[PDB]
Amino acid sequence: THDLRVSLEEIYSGCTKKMKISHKRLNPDGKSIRNEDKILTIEVKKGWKEGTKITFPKEGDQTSNNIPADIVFVLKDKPHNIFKRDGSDVIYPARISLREALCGCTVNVPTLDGRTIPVVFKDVIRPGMRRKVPGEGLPLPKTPEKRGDLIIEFEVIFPERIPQTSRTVLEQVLPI
């Protein structure tokens, strides 16, 4: 029972995982132990979700009279440094200044195949607001021609401090 870690990019295009296992083997001679190497091949289908199980029958250890153990791989999402995976969607955290949130913003959203898409915002952006960029998520695994969405998730970064100057002005333009 073993973790197969797969990057977002590998889930997006699909990939091949070549895992070498070292199991103990009963020799042609029925009464001794031998170490044996064997590459197990996993075909990662595009869009596969974490928890997918890949079972290689009887690839465990061999010695006695009983049936050798199954090797079960379980797919795990590897942390990605740009996106957080959410099913077939990917979430893109966009950190913007409070100035941009109140006065207008362009987010250059990165894509899974390494381009960027400019998304222009004219209205007030609120802390935690989300904006869908349709079809820019991961392939759906059963119908890989269709894709999920890329979801912009805003974090609005506040000034560390406000000088008294600025405070007096903010008091005149912002609602109580």
């Binding site: 895992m19 070292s22 090797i71």
Partner: peptide, 8 residues
């Protein structure tokens, strides 16, 4: 429990 590691 036999060892398991990735290769090419």
């Amino acid at each position: 429990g036999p060892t398991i590691e990735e290769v090419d």
